[PDB]
Structures are given as structure tokens and as C-alpha cells.
Amino acid sequence: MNVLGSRKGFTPALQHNSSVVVADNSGAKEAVIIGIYGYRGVLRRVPFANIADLVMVSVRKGSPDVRKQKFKAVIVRQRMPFRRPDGTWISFEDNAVVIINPDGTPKGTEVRGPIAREAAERWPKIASVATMVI
Amino acid sequence: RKLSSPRRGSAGLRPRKRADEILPTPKNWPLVNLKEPKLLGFIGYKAGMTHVYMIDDKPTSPNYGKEVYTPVTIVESPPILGLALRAYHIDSKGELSVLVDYWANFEEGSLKYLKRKITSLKVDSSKMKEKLDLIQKNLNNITYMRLLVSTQPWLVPSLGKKRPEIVEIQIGGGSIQDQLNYGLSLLGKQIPVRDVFREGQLTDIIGVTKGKGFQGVIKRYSVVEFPRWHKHRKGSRKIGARGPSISTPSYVPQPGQLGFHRRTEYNKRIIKIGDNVNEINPAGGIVNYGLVKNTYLVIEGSVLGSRKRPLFLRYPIRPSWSPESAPKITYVNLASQQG
Amino acid sequence: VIVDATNQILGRMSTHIAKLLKSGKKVYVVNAEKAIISGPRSRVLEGYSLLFTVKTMQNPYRQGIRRPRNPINIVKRTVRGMLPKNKLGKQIYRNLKAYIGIPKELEGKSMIRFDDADVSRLKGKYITVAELSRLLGGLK
Amino acid sequence: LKAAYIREEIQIPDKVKVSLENNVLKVKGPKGEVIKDFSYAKGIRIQLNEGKIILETTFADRRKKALLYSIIAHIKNMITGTINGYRYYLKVISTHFPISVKVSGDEVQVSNLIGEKNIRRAKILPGVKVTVKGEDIVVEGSDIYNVAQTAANIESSTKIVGYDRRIFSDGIYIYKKEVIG
Amino acid sequence: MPLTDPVKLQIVQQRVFLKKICRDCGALNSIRATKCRRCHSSNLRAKKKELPAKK
RNA sequence: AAGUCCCGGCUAAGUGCCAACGAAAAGGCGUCUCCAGCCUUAGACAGCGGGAAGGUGGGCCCAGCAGCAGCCAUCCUCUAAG
RNA sequence: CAGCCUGGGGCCUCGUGAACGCCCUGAGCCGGUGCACAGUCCGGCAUCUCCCUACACCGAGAGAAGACCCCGUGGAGCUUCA
RNA sequence: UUUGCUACAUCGAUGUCGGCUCUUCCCACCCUGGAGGUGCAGCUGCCUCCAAGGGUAGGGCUGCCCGCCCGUUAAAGGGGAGCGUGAGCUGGGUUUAGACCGUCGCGAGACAGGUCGGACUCUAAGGGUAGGGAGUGCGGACCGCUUGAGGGGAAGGAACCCC
RNA sequence: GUAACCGCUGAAAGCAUCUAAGCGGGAACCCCUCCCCUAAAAGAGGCGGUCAGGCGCCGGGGCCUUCCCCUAGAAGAG
């Protein structure tokens, strides 16, 4: 939303039908990557996603009122080894996303676990309720 | 139903064959660009590579004024020993053949290194006088002026060889009369890379890539493994069809040699020209190469070709940006390439 | 035997070359860039441009290959493609030479013209040979 | 029809010397002098009278007679410039951003247009003078064609306003031409 | 139009009486020309200027 | 294999250089020749300025339509002109 | 969305040692013609020869009087209210 | 490009649908470029013309084609090449022999109505192709370096963001 | 250099007219600059150097294999 003109993107992480946890207080707990915004691909190359990407998933485990529903989020946690511009390598023990409202602000009001610095700039609303940033 | 697909493999470089001289040569030269007599390239060797720490010099860099990490290749730069001057002119039929050569090592150069590979001139008729003034007589009707130089690998134990290569470089500068005199001086002596280059320049690379042997189509042109079932059925590592008909069994991925090619490289900016071997030598002797013991060229990115290949360098043909000198550094990795 | 093609129509000038070819006497042509072809710029290029495959050029003239673009390439195909297809047709083609300007050692010898090829016989809207290579790919 | 024998004459004005040779015409006048070639007048014979211009031809077609009169007009226009000056006028109207133009040798540069930061340039034919006073651009010279093509080159440069906007009547435009002086 | 002429009835000088356009080839022509410059269709319609005030 | 054969005229697209074969209706004053009809030295067309008009902008309904809002007539002040 | 390694083949070397396609050895490619998709014909484009390996795109490749449709006053089989 | 007829060619075989991979072509342009008109304030539009250089996805249901739809993207153009391609492949559809079911038949059984299984051969003489090697001529033996006719190309293309 | 087209000088046809000749711009369009293989390009290139010395002979000079390895690879090659 605000920083993607910089080095928005890193080594390949995820794919369609990839399952991630919901790290907030929204009510959703488990979600599967259903689609990728923006990206355009080529023959047989599965579409991509990593940290700080407008991503589209659906609710698999969570409150019934959100079960089997469509919502937007951003990617905050990945297991991939990758190289930061200052040449450090960051990883997250699992893969998590935070659901965002269609305007851009997160739907949830709480944040679970650390987030790589990159998401905060691309989504300052996330940084608004962000607790710790790595 | 016949979805879109870019033609796979690279049709641009057909034919793909192996070079006939280990040390290639440029076929064009970037313009002199309004300056004085000096050379436009250099020779060297591929010693190894590492990663380096610098402040960004690109004024428009997104990383400007910060320390970022980047792989960097080392190029030992042994001194160059010139041989002769070659005359090119619009001859009969309006072509640019060699008018004449101008050799002189009888006045200086009691070196049998050249003798190892060429049974070169004797003192009997070292009468280049009538040759040299021929240039003077043919002055003002000359177009290009290259230079005969040789490498001195015997000053580098890393490459266990003693018969050297003699190769060429075209010189641009001010007036033609100046250039011949400029070259005339350079004969019979030794020339450092600093005599041609300075830090913060761009440089071009033409050389021979890492050979690989006869290859497979899967590897040669990155053709695709057939899906699933062929990993079990009738064969997997081949293209299915080979053309609509004998109407040109065409430029299609077919096996053959890959590597050891004459190739190209653009937009390479130097980092450091140091002279202390201890500043760059890694732990335990650089891998597969030895211990650099002459002046070296600190070039980032990747450089084509296998270790222990001569490399011939060149000014930028289509430089992306005009660089300033000295992208200063902050760290050099002396850690073992092993481990 | 030497012929000048200055201000001559290439197709027209081509003809009497051939009979001299069929005669069995060695010939030469000088200043070939000084012939012309009737027609406006668009067509004459277009009527030749259609044959292109690729662009570059990397030798002295000597090949004689499937696509001509040097100033003395074009004369050859126009004179070659107007020669007997039998074996002697190739052999007679061996006895022809092409030039730009004037070779030094042929200056002091006679030259002749073909009156039927005079520009005056044509109404107008012609282009010189050397102009073609500028558009055809000849740096010269 | 077929025009049988059409002849026209041009009375050369005083204070002018005229030279003709090799089917190449040059006219000298107090304002200036320009050489204009006429080798392309096939089917037309040109006679330079000592005190006038003799133009004759026999059995011209519909094409040629238009050509002949076409040749006639330029020659007097050639004469006209050498005596009286050609002064085209370019009036500039801008809506939101005032327009600035400066001379660069043989090239013209215009900027500060409707909001684009780029530069715009046009080419001026040699031997042609063009200046600006204010809200108007003065194009001087003897050759009539030289100024107009030069004037037009400006007009092309300022046309860029025309993409996906209804024209805002903003830019550089021709105003008038040919003051008597 | 942003297109003017040496000395004619061009619009920009305080008016909008635009030129004539061809209904067939989609190009423009002179004001009083009776046919297209390209296809000569002669079914040329004047370019609309603007709705100045009202009906 | 023999004509760069001749006269006259037309084509600017390589139209074309095609017997057996390969383009319709329409558009073209693009060009080249031919039939009508109407004005022209009692001054033709075009071109350039003026008179280029008035009771009256008559007007009917109509604030006003002051030819040209919806139907429409119509006389001399007149003359090298309305 | 591919990658590395190992055994046996496949590579090479000694010894042994076949069969398939064969009017031909004359077959490069492209338009054309013709049984309406040529190796020879026509018109161009090219085209030095010899050798080894990989590919099966073509050779309308080879394998088999098509397993389908129909004909023969041709068989066999089955059934019944022939 | 399909689809209707034609039986001129193929019945001592030109092995049949789809799909996979892979190459190329064409333009009646989907997007990208150029220009214009518009019942074009600007964005979004709508339409014409030129332009084939490049690109033109990923999924679900259906074997397909077609079709319906999901979420992005510049859009997710359409056709050819023996409905391109089996001595490269899958056998899912479909062309046998076994059965079941529905309609008809007293019966042998028929169906173009549905459903389960059902064999996919070949060591490249010749060419093409991709490499790698010897020789003759170009010219006595050589060693070395170079000129640089043509050949191929997409060697780049696209989008998003900052101001 | 061009497509479409946009211009200008301009007659035909007094005016007018971007076009008829005449002249200028004007694209992922065609070409040249880039890279890649090139003296089997038949016009088959050019330039440097050596091939000695002595009396067909002596002689040696060059090259290749053999030799040791790998920058390289199926051998060949390099």
C-alpha cells in the first residue's frame, strides 16, 4: 500500500492451497491460500507469495460466523531462508497471516507473535497494532 | 488448447559450437568519447570470488549510502608485455586488412618466454626502419590502431604455464599522430592495469564460459520433464515431437555441447585495485587456485568462465550509468572457501 | 574488356553483359554504384526489401551468398540470375568481376557504354545504386 | 484539352540582380538572397531575359500546366522575400500555466506547459531568424518556405496537448504573417 | 484542434470553428472541400464545437 | 532463335508483364478521350469593396421571436441596387 | 520444478557375430504442376568431400491381401410363425 | 477455421478423438505502440484506422470440445500447419469378444439409450537436425595474429511504485 | 527508412487546396550500431617471422606421436 516500490519480495515461499495459521483475535484460526493478488505468471509456474503481499485465503478452522468465508490478509511469517538487504537471513518457525479489511486495515485487533519489519511499511495499519517487530 | 508459451531454449545464439582459441577477442570497440590516448581494455585471470561490504555509490540507488552485501570476484592482474604495432588501413577493394606490423624486442626483451611459442625474429634483419616510416608515409590514411601485447603468466605460479598468449587491443584517443606516438612509447616495457584502468570504472567482459561436456537437453535448454506418468513410462528426458513435418526440422532443443562458449557480459563496475596480497587472500590458500601474488582486480557480480582461464576486458559498450571512482569498502572475507 | 555503368540502367545494362558473357571473354565493371533503377523510393526499396531475413554483415565482399546487400552484391545477382542455368552458366559467372569506383590498374584502358541503358531513355524517378546500400545495409 | 503553347513572363523588379545557370536559379535582393534549384522542371524550358523572366512550353498536359504555374508562384515569392520581409506571427494562449520560450542557436525550446516537466523542441532551417517579444513570436526571413516549415515545427511541438483531452486551445499557434516590411 | 495554418480561419485565435472530417477514412479535411482528401467520400460532417449556453 | 522493331495514345500501382486462370455492387473531377444542357466581349465564372437597404422588426396568437417559436401573405421609397 | 549420486546398459577396446525396410543411390530446400501433398518434371535458392555420436522430424519409414463399409445370384453358424 | 454435398486420390492399411511436450505460421489486434473521432470536464468510457515485434496465465466441474464458474492479471484473441505432432507418450472418449439395465421381438437378437474390464510393435540403410572431428583447393613447409562479405536474434519484454 | 497520419510551399481550378509535382516530421514497423560462426567467402584475403649451413649428398630445422598432467572432454580435440 505504501512501500512496495522498494524491495517488495524475496525468495519463493508459498503456493496455492497452502495452509497457514491466523495470528490475531478475529476468530479465524486456520486458513488455506486460495489465491494471489497482483502477480502474473507463466506456463505451469504456480503463482507466488511471500512476506508483505496482498493475499487471499479462506477460513478453515475458527468461529462458525467466519467459517467457510472469504477475507483478505497479508503474509507475516514464513519458514524460507532468505537474504535481507543488509545481508542477514530471517525465518519464522511457522507461517502466519493477519486478516485485513477491504480498505486495508486489519480486521483483527490483536497481533500474535513477531513480524518481519517489511510488512509494517507496506501496511502501516498492521504496524499500528503491531506488538513486536523483527 | 495450444496455450501461450515462449519458445524454450535460446534461439538467439545458434549455432552453439566451441571456440577455437582459448582466449577470445572483441569484434567491436566502444567509442573513444572525447579524450586522450589510452587503451580500452585489459587482460587477466579468473582467480576466485568472495563477498564484500560497501557504501552504495549509485546516486539513484534504493540502497544509497548504506552497507549492503554483495558477491565479488577477484582477478589477478599480472603485468602486460607489449609486442608490436599493427597498421590497419582502407586497402585495395576498400577493406581494413593489416597494412603492416611493427615488431621490436631486439632493442629490449631478451626473453625466451615469447620464444616458447613463436620462433620470432632474429637480429639479422631487424630493419623495421623501412616498415616504421611506411606508417609515416601512410600517415593520415589510417583508420584503426591496435596493439600487440602478451601476458606474463610466468609471474603467476597459480597457472602452471610458461608459453604465453599474444593478443590485441585497439587504442583510441586524441589525434592519430598522437596515438601512434603514445603507442610507440608503450613498446618494449611493462604496463600495469593502473596504466589503463582506475577504480570506479565500468568494464566489459568477453571470454570462454565454464565447459561442461556433452550435455542433456533437460540441462542444455532447460526443457521440461514430462509430467508424472513419464517419470514411470517410456522415457522422460527428451522432447516429444521434433517439428510439424520435414518442413524444417527446425531450431528445436537438441542435445550437444554446452559450455566453453564465446559469450558476452555487460555493465561491470570495478571495486578495488589493491596491491597487498594479504588484504584479499582467503584462509588456507584460495580454492583450486593458489595464493595471489600480484595486483588484483576486485569485480562484483559474477564473471563467466572456469577458474584458471585468461580473461580479456574492455570499456563499456553501452554503459547504463556513468560511475564515479572508489566505492569504498568495509569488509573482506578471508574465511576459508572450504568449510 | 571494360564497361562503365555510370548513368546506366542496371536491368538494361545487364543484358549486353550476358552476350559478352556467352561470348567467352573476361570482363570488368567499374563505378557500378553509378547505375540507376527507375521508380520511386518506396517501391524500389520495397521491391527489394521483401527478401530480408536478418541484418548483420561480417566479412570482405567475397562470399556471394543467398541475400545481397553490398553495392557490388546487387549487381551480381542481377547479372547472375540472368545467365544460363547449365554448367557453363556457373563457369561463365566465374569470369566476372565487380568494383566500386575505379581499380588503379584499370584506369589506363578504354571503357564503353550501352546507349540503350542511358538515363535519357527514361522519363525520370530513378535512384542511384550507391543510395541503395545506405538503405539496404551497406555502410559503404 | 491540350494546352498548345503557353507562355508567361515575370517582370524582374529593380534593385535586383538575377543569375541563372545549369538549371539552377539564384536571386539576390536587398533583404537577402537564396539559391533555389529547379532541375526538376522536365518538359519546361527556362529563358532568363535580360529584363524579365521568359517561361515557355509546348503541348503541356493537365499535370504540366499546374506545374508551370506552380513554378511561377515560387519564383515571384523568391523575388518577394528579397524585397519585402516575411513576418509570420505565432500567438500563444495558455489557460493555467504561463508559457516560456527561449532560443538555442538553431533550435527552439518551450516548457512550463500544462503541467508536464519535459522539454519540447523544434528545428529551425538555416538562415532563418525567429524572435519573441511577448505573447507573440516573430519569424523573420526571406524564403517563404523556410519560415513556415520552421513555424510549423513549433506548431507540431505544441500539439502534444491532443491526447484524450478535449482540446483546451492551449499552446503555441499561428497568428498572422507577412507584414509589408 | 491544436492544428493551425499559415493564414486561414483557424480556431485558436478566439474562436472554435473547427475543420471538416471524413466519415469514411476517419481523417480531417479542409473547411470548404467537398470531398475527402483520402477516400473522396464527400459525406463529410463538421466537427462539433461545443454546447455554448443552452438550446 | 530471332526486334531493346516503328507510329500514335494511356497507365505510377511493380496496377501489370495470365487465352484455357486470377475480384462484385459502390465510391473517385485520380487521370485520359470523347453527347447533351445553361451563362459568356451588350464584358462569363472566380476573385476583390460598396450599395447590400426602408413604412417594416408589418405581423396572428405571442414578455419577444424584431425573416429563421407553430400557419402564411404581401405592396412601393425604388433603380446601374436589393 | 527441478537437482545430486550409485549398479547394469548405453562410451571405447579384443573376440564372436545377425535380421528390417532395397525399381534405384541419382534423393538438400522452397513455390508450382500433375491422380488435386515429388527424388528425379518446371522455376528459383543454395549446396566441397570424408568420418563419429545424439535425435527419431521426414523419407506420404517398416510390421501385416484393413479388424470397419459394400460387392460376389461366395461360405459357415444361430433362430423361427421362411 | 466447423458444418452440409462431391466421390477425383487412398481398401495386398496414410493406424482413428483428446490431452501432454515441442516448433512455426497467419491476421479478421485481446493487451502492449502510433493516430483520430466521440452524445471525450478528468478517470472510466465507446468507436475507427495502422501496426503480428513480444506477451496472452492459474484453478474447479466436464474425458473431451463446448459450456458454467472461482480469484488475480494487460488481457487471460481466434485460427492453421494430414481437425500440426503414437517408428515421442496417456488411454480418459470411442471400434470388437464378456455382462447388466431400459425400449422392441414368440424367437435368433437389434438398439446409438446408459454402465464395469478389455494387448498402444519396431536396433534409423537415406535425408533433416546438433555437435565434434580429417583432407584438397584456395597456396612450398610451417608458427602466430588479424580484415570481417552473410548468417540468427526478442536478447529483451511487461507491469507496479516514488515523486 | 518507413505505415497510418499530421504539416508546409503550392497550382491545377485566379480564390481555395497538406499533394499533383516539391519539401518536413511522424511508431513495440524494416535496417545500423550488440552479441554469436565464419578465408570452402571460388574475388577463396592481408601482416610478422623461420626454413639454415656446407659439399643430388652431409647436416640440421620444423612438426606429430610417444612422455606427465588438466583448465577439457565419448574417443578427437583444447
TrEMBL record, chain E:
SUPFAM superfamilies to which the protein is assigned, alphabetical: Zn-binding ribosomal proteins
A Pfam entry, by short name: Ribosomal_L40e
GO CC annotation terms, alphabetical: ribonucleoprotein complex; ribosome
Keyword ATP-binding: no
First and last residue of the signal peptide: none
Keywords carried by this UniProt record: Ribonucleoprotein, Ribosomal protein
Molecular function terms from GO: structural constituent of ribosome
Tagged with keyword Electron transport: no
GO BP field: translation
InterPro entries in alphabetical order: Ribosomal_eL40_arc, Ribosomal_eL40_dom, Ribosomal_eL40_sf, Ribosomal_zn-bd
The Large ribosomal subunit protein eL40 domain, residue ranges: 3-51
Database matches in PANTHER family: 50S RIBOSOMAL PROTEIN L40E, LARGE RIBOSOMAL SUBUNIT PROTEIN EL40
Name of the protein in its database record: 50S ribosomal protein L40e
